[PDB]
Each structure stands twice: as structure tokens, then as C-alpha cells.
């Protein structure tokens, strides 16, 4: 199951890859935050925007739609 | 049976009842991987991101070896663009020293965002946790591709120091010969091949010989090319004679 | 009704073990109630195909 | 009778630096710097931490009953009409009543109004205020005692 | 025995390496030139007449008792909503107590 999941993972990560703009926009303004360690206090404070959540749900469906086959 | 009941409440959108079914089901067999997945999926769909976070965070503490949870959690943060938060999940994962493939996912994460110098530092940590010849070649070729040859050589020098007194794989020396070939240090290349040929048996060293004989076909004189080939043939004919 | 068990599952969440709760606040976020639509829904539609 | 600059705390969690007003309460400041100088806080802990109120700290007994001074167990107050308990991160001398101050300070976490009736302010925190909040997020009990040790490692009356 | 004793020390460098050594050294120097976030100014030392109003003014933080305005560094001391999150508690000098 691991290997097919890995193949899935390689497939999913390559499809998110063209979204460079949101990364580039974030990196300047959030560069003071962009590099945290495991002990940094950022965990528990991140409130994502609704549109990002929407993108996740749609992409989850794409995983399900593959899983359907 | 629990999953069927929870999915039926999910169809009725009675999320507060569905939540309680999953929690009660964990009390009977918390180790069932598929149970955690179904619970976390249901919260994500309904945009209840903070509920899903609490489910993932509980899951990695109780079941650290279930690799699938880590991948899915990062995948949530990556889709949300929380590149910072994703790292924290990755960093806490590396504390447990997971399997090789996990590291490569973390390496590729930095590589997707072109953070070459960070990828280097992770490579150094990775090679120390997983001291396998394959990882050293990967690291060395990485520096080589970006033309940081002063770094790449040191990686090769440390590799032949580390393995050389314990085990000697031809794979490293063929790679390191190609480095000095790019450096055009043909004298260094010949030293590398001789050092390998004097210790590795001629019957395993055929691919060693094959690259070397091609190497001499690129830059060596015809006399030098024939002698290395004749000595190989002499060994072959001696095997025929034996 | 002359029974000691049954009708209790309609009054409340029967065995409400709460979700565990920590590091993210989530007393705030809450969910849209079920769209009823009692002019098209059927017994076959709730169970599914 | 010399006037050192800013006092470096070196807690278990990190560094915190206190600023002290030689303008308004010099006697407490000399006392606080001297106890920091001799090493009277090296190993004392934040024994009483009330969430969103204050952090009482500094006692070799660790009880919240102990402490002496360089004058001996007591000295007067310096209830100055300028300093007012306003916001988090004020440093102040913990009290047991009128004109009785030992060697227990407390760093404050919220605006408090009844406090400046009966306590002496001398100080405010100026370096790594978030680390104070991390001390603020420490597990408590019925008597508001930490489970782990939040102790001050070393202290320097630097400059 | 390692090739570091069988290969000469890097006194052997082709012209391509000479150019590449200067290029690789400069590339390291260029990648660290990203200064990132320029941080806030510290407050004034002779605080007469100054009043902090923004979060920026605090800089390093801490409230000023000699300035008679209600201060809330890092939103501390403000009346918080009923949050059900248990405190993100951190041990003495270790990692966050998950």
C-alpha cells in the first residue's frame, strides 16, 4: 500500500507545483516567520483563508476520484 | 460497523453525532489506521480545519510509525500554503528518525521552493542518519549540478575516507572518476581507477574496466588504451587456460 | 410506550464523548445545519443507491 | 553605592533583561542589583504563576514565605506617584504588607488597578517579552505551582 | 586507506575549475545577501511626551509604567474570548510539551 500511496504522493505533489505565485507572495511578507523550528510558537495560531480550504476540498475529491477507479 | 453508522450521520450532516461515534470507536481500537483517516476526512470536507488539526496532532503522538498520517498532515498545510507550519510537522517527524523516503519528501519540499542551501543541510543530516553509499552519490551529484565543485569534492573525499576502510563499492569510484573527468584531472582519474583495480577483483571490475577503457578512449593515447585492454584480455585468456 | 430502551436516541446525542481539544481553539467554528428539503427527499435517497 | 545598568536574567527558558529606574526607587535597585551580583537568585524559581496576573519569583526557600534583604528582612516602601500598574511586563517588588519588602519580585502580565495601592514598582522588562508569555503558559495547580522547574539559572548586573 | 593520500591536494586545478571556484565562492556569498525582514525601531530613552499607540512602538516589547496610557504588548492583557484550547505549555529548556 505504501508504494502506491508514494506513487499517489508523487502524482499529487507534482500537480500542486505550478502554484508558485502564492508561495512567492508569502515568502517576502512572511520571511520573518517563513523559517520556523519545531519549538517555535507558530503552531496553533495559523488561521487559513476560506479559499485555501476550498482548494483543499476540491483536491481531496480529485484523490477520491482516483481512488474510485 | 462503526464506520457505517458514522457515514450515515455524515449523510444527514449531523456532524455532532458523527464526531461522538468516531471518538467512541477509538476507545475500542485506537490502533486501526483507517478509523483515524475517516474521522479526519469528514472534518476537512466540512471546512472544520481546527477539528481536523486536533485529530492529526493526536494521531502522530499515539501512532508515530504510521507514515501515512505525516504525509496527509503536511499535504493539508501545503494546500493551505502554510509552508512554515508544514516544516514544523516535518521537523517533529525527523526527531523520530523515519525511513529514507520520508527525508526525500522533506528534501524535495525545499527543492520545490529552490532553497538549495537548506536542502544541503538536510542532506548532511540525512546521510548521518542513513549512511548508505547511494545517499553520498546523491548529495555529491547535487553539489556538482550547481557547479559548487569545492563542496562536491569534499563530499567525495569524505565518502572514500568513511567507506574505504570498511567496504569498497565500485559505484562511488565510477561517479568520482566522472567528477574529476569534468574537472579534466585525467591524472587523478587514472589514480582512482588503479586504486580500485588493485583491490577489486577483475571479474567484478568489468563495469569499472568498461568506463575506464572508454575514459582512455576519450583522452588516453592508443598505446595506453591497448595495454589496459590487453591486460584485461590476458586475464580473460588466462581464465580460458585455467 | 412501555419500554426501558429505544426513544433515548432521539432526545440528544446518545453517548456524547466529546472530541479532544487542544493547541487550536475550536469553540468558535461551527457547521451549517442539514438542509431539510421535505418535498424531494425519499427513503431511498437517505440510504443511497 | 554604585549604579549598574540593566539586569540580565538568565532563566531556564531563555534570557530576559530588566530595566531599572535609578530616577525613582534607587534603594530597591541597589538591593536588587546586589542580590543579583552576589548570586542570591542563582537557582531560585518562579514559584507562584497566576495566569493573566503576574509571576512571583525569587526565593532560595522556594516557598513564597522566604527571603531576606541586604538591610535584613525588611525595608520601607517607595510608593512613587509616577509609576502605575499598566500593561504587562512591569517589574515590581512583591509585598507582605506595609513597609516590608524582602527579595521577591514579580513581573506582571495584565493591567491591574488595585495593585499600585500597596506595591512598589521599580522596573520593566525590555528584551524578549514573548519568553515572559512562555513562562506565562506554564502548567499550574490549586496553589498555582508549576510542575517543572522554571528557575533562574544566573543573573548579571551588567554594564 | 583513502584516495586523499593517493590523490594530490587541490594544487591541480583546470582553468574551468579556477573560474568555477570563484563562481562557487561568490554564489555562496550571493545566497546569504537576502537580509529578509528589517525589524522595528526601539523606543526612545528619554521618554518625555512619547505615547505608544501601535504594536510597532513596543519594538522589543514591555509596557512603560511612566506613560499613563493602557498598553497591550503582543495583545497580552486584553480580554480574551472563551477559547477551549489547552495552553501550549513548554518545558524548562526542552521542546514544547506535546
Swiss-Prot record, chain A:
Main localization category: nucleus
Keywords on record: Acetylation, Coiled coil, Isopeptide bond, mRNA processing, mRNA splicing, Nucleus, Spliceosome, Ubl conjugation
Alphabetical GO biological process terms: embryonic organ development; gastrulation; in utero embryonic development; mitotic G2 DNA damage checkpoint signaling; mRNA splicing, via spliceosome; positive regulation of cell population proliferation
Positions of disulphide bridges: none
Leader peptide range in chain numbering: none
Main function: Involved in pre-mRNA splicing as component of the spliceosome.
Family: Belongs to the SYF2 family.
Protein name stated in the entry: Pre-mRNA-splicing factor SYF2
Organism, scientific name: Homo sapiens (Human)
UniProt lineage: Eukaryota, Metazoa, Chordata, Craniata, Vertebrata
Swiss-Prot record, chain C:
Intracellular or extracellular location(s): Nucleus; Nucleus speckle; Cytoplasm
Quaternary structure and interacting proteins, as annotated: Homodimer. Interacts with DAPK3. Component of the precatalytic, catalytic and postcatalytic spliceosome complexes. Part of a spliceosomal 'core' complex consisting of CDC5L, PLRG1, SPF27, CCAP1, CCAP3 and CCAP6. Interacts with PLRG1, Lodestar/TTF2, and NIPP1/PPP1R8. Component of the minor spliceosome, which splices U12-type introns. Within this complex, interacts with SCNM1. Component of the PRP19-CDC5L splicing complex composed of a core complex comprising a homotetramer of PRPF19, CDC5L, PLRG1 and BCAS2, and at least three less stably associated proteins CTNNBL1, CWC15 and HSPA8.
Region: Required for interaction with CTNNBL1, residue numbers: 1-5
Free-text function comment from the UniProt entry: DNA-binding protein involved in cell cycle control. May act as a transcription activator. Plays a role in pre-mRNA splicing as core component of precatalytic, catalytic and postcatalytic spliceosomal complexes. Component of the PRP19-CDC5L complex that forms an integral part of the spliceosome and is required for activating pre-mRNA splicing. The PRP19-CDC5L complex may also play a role in the response to DNA damage (DDR). As a component of the minor spliceosome, involved in the splicing of U12-type introns in pre-mRNAs.
Recorded consequence of changing residue 26 to A: Abolishes phosphorylation. No effect on homodimerization nor on nuclear localization
Organism: Homo sapiens
Cross-link Glycyl lysine isopeptide (Lys-Gly) (interchain with G-Cter in SUMO2) mapped to chain: 18
From Swiss-Prot, chain D:
Localization per record: Nucleus
Gene Ontology CC terms, in alphabetical order: catalytic step 2 spliceosome; nucleoplasm; nucleus; U2-type catalytic step 2 spliceosome
A GO MF term: peptidyl-prolyl cis-trans isomerase activity
Domain PPIase cyclophilin-type residues, every copy: 3-157
Binding site for cyclosporin A: 47-58, 63-64, 92-97, 102-106, 112, 118
Outcome when changing residue 100 to A: In PCH14; uncertain significance; reduced interaction with SNW1; no effect on protein expression level, but shows reduced thermal stability and increased aggregation propensity in vitro
Record Pfam families: Pro_isomerase
UniProt keyword Phosphoprotein present: yes
Phosphoserine: residues carrying this PTM: 142
Phenotype for residue 71 to C: In PCH14; uncertain significance; strongly reduced protein levels compared to wild-type after transfection in HEK293T cell line
UniProt superkingdom: Eukaryota
UniProt KW keywords: Disease variant, Intellectual disability, Isomerase, mRNA processing, mRNA splicing, Nucleus, Phosphoprotein, Rotamase, Spliceosome
Expression across tissues: Ubiquitous, with the most abundant expression in heart and skeletal muscle.
GO biological process: embryonic brain development; mRNA splicing, via spliceosome; protein folding; protein peptidyl-prolyl isomerization
Segments traversing the membrane: none
Regulation: Inhibited by Cyclosporin A.
Reaction equation(s) it catalyzes: [protein]-peptidylproline (omega=180) = [protein]-peptidylproline (omega=0)
The protein's Enzyme Commission number: 5.2.1.8
InterPro entries on file: Cyclophilin-like_dom_sf, Cyclophilin-type_PPIase, Cyclophilin-type_PPIase_CS, Cyclophilin-type_PPIase_dom, Cyclophilin_A-like
Subunit structure: Identified in the spliceosome C complex. Interacts with SNW1/SKIP. Interacts with CDC40/PRP17; this interaction leads to CDC40 isomerization. Interacts with RBM22.
Curated annotation (Swiss-Prot), chain E:
N-acetylalanine: modified positions: 2
Localization per Swiss-Prot or TrEMBL: Nucleus
Phosphoserine modifications at: 14
Region (Interaction with PPIL1): 59-79
Segments for region (Disordered): 1-46
Glycyl lysine isopeptide (Lys-Gly) (interchain with G-Cter in SUMO2) crosslink site(s): 23, 81, 97
Domain of life per record: Eukaryota
Similarity comment text for this entry: Belongs to the SNW family.
Function field: Involved in pre-mRNA splicing as component of the spliceosome. As a component of the minor spliceosome, involved in the splicing of U12-type introns in pre-mRNAs. Required for the specific splicing of CDKN1A pre-mRNA; the function probably involves the recruitment of U2AF2 to the mRNA. May recruit PPIL1 to the spliceosome. May be involved in cyclin-D1/CCND1 mRNA stability through the SNARP complex which associates with both the 3'end of the CCND1 gene and its mRNA. Involved in transcriptional regulation. (Microbial infection) Is recruited by HIV-1 Tat to Tat:P-TEFb:TAR RNA complexes and is involved in Tat transcription by recruitment of MYC, MEN1 and TRRAP to the HIV promoter.
Entry protein name: SNW domain-containing protein 1
Organism encoding this protein: Homo sapiens (Human)
Amino acid at each position: 500500500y505504501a508504494a502506491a500511496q508514494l506513487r499517489q504522493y508523487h502524482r499529487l505533489t507534482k500537480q500542486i507545483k505550478p502554484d508558485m505565485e502564492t508561495y512567492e507572495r508569502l515568502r517576502e511578507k512572511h520571511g520573518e516567520e517563513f523559517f520556523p523550528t519545531s519549538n517555535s510558537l507558530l503552531h496553533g495560531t495559523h488561521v487559513p483563508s476560506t479559499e485555501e480550504i476550498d482548494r483543499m476540498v476540491i483536491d481531496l475529491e480529485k484523490q477520491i476520484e482516483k481512488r474510485d477507479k | 460497523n462503526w464506520i457505517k453508522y458514522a457515514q450515515w450521520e455524515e449523510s444527514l450532516k449531523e456532524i455532532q453525532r458523527a464526531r461522538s461515534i468516531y471518538e467512541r470507536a477509538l476507545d475500542v481500537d485506537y490502533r486501526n489506521i483507517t478509523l483515524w483517516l475517516k474521522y479526519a476526512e469528514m472534518e476537512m470536507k466540512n471546512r472544520q480545519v481546527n477539528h481536523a488539526r486536533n485529530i492529526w496532532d493526536r494521531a502522530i503522538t499515539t501512532l508515530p510509525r504510521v507514515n501515512q498520517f505525516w504525509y496527509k498532515y503536511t499535504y493539508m498545510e501545503e494546500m493551505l500554503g502554510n509552508v512554515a507550519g508544514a516544516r514544523q510537522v516535518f521537523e517533529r517527524w525527523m526527531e523520530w528518525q523515519p525511513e529514507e523516503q520520508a527525508w526525500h519528501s522533506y528534501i524535495n519540499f525545499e527543492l520545490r521552493y529552490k532553497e538549495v542551501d537548506r536542502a544541503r543541510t538536510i542532506y548532511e543530516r540525512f546521510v548521518l542518519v542513513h549512511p548508505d553509499v547511494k545517499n553520498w552519490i546523491k548529495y555529491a551529484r547535487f553539489e556538482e549540478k550547481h557547479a559548487y565543485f569545492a563542496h562536491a569534492r569534499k563530499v567525495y573525499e569524505r565518502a572514500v575516507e568513511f567507506f574505504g576502510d570498511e567496504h569498497m563499492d565500485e559505484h562511488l569510484y565510477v561517479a568520482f572518476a566522472k567528477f574529476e573527468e569534468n574537472q579534466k584531472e585525467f591524472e587523478r582519474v587514472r589514480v582512482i581507477y588503479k586504486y580500485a583495480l588493485d583491490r577489486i577483483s577483475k571479474q567484478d571490475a568489468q563495469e569499472l574496466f568498461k568506463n575506464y577503457t572508454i575514459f582512455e578512449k576519450k583522452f588516453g593515447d592508443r598505446r595506453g588504451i591497448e595495454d589496459i585492454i590487453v591486460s584485461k584480455r590476458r586475464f580473460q585468456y588466462e581464465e580460458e587456460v585455467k | 410506550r412501555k419500554r426501558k430502551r429505544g426513544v433515548d436516541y432521539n432526545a440528544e446525542i446518545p453517548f456524547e464523548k466529546k472530541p479532544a481539544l487542544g493547541f487550536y481553539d475550536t469553540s468558535e467554528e461551527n457547521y451549517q445545519a442539514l438542509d431539510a428539503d421535505f418535498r424531494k427527499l425519499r427513503q431511498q435517497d437517505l440510504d443511497g443507491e | 553605592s554604585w549604579q549598574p545598568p540593566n539586569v540580565y536574567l538568565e532563566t531556564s527558558m531563555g534570557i530576559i533583561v530588566l530595566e531599572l529606574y535609578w530616577k525613582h526607587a534607587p534603594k530597591t535597585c541597589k538591593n536588587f542589583a546586589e542580590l543579583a551580583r552576589r548570586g542570591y537568585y542563582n537557582g531560585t524559581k518562579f514559584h507562584r504563576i497566576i495566569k493573566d496576573f503576574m509571576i512571583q519569583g525569587g526565593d532560595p526557600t522556594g516557598t513564597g514565605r522566604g527571603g531576606a534583604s541586604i538591610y535584613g528582612k525588611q525595608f520601607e516602601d517607595e510608593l512613587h506617584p509616577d509609576l502605575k500598574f499598566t500593561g504587562a511586563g512591569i517589574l515590581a517588588m512583591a509585598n507582605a504588607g506595609p513597609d516590608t519588602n524582602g527579595s521577591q519580585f514579580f513581573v506582571t502580565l495584565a493591567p491591574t488597578q488595585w495593585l499600585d495601592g500597596k506595591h512598589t514598582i521599580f522596573g520593566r522588562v525590555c528584551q524578549g517579552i514573548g519568553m515572559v508569555n512562555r513562562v506565562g503558559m506554564v502548567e499550574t495547580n490549586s496553589q498555582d505551582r508549576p510542575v517543572d522547574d522554571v528557575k533562574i539559572i544566573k543573573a548579571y548586573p551588567s554594564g | 586507506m583513502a584516495l586523499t593520500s593517493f590523490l594530490p591536494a587541490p594544487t591541480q586545478l583546470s582553468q574551468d575549475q579556477l573560474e568555477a571556484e570563484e563562481k562557487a565562492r561568490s554564489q555562496r556569498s550571493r545566497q546569504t545577501s537576502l537580509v529578509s525582514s528589517r525589524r522595528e525601531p526601539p523606543p526612545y530613552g528619554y521618554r518625555k511626551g512619547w505615547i505608544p499607540r501601535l504594536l510597532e512602538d513596543f519594538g522589543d516589547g514591555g509596557a512603560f509604567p511612566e506613560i499613563h496610557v493602557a498598553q497591550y504588548p503582543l495583545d497580552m492583557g486584553r480580554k480574551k474570548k472563551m477559547s477551549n484550547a489547552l495552553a501550549i505549555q513548554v518545558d524548562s529548556e526542552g521542546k514544547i510539551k506535546y
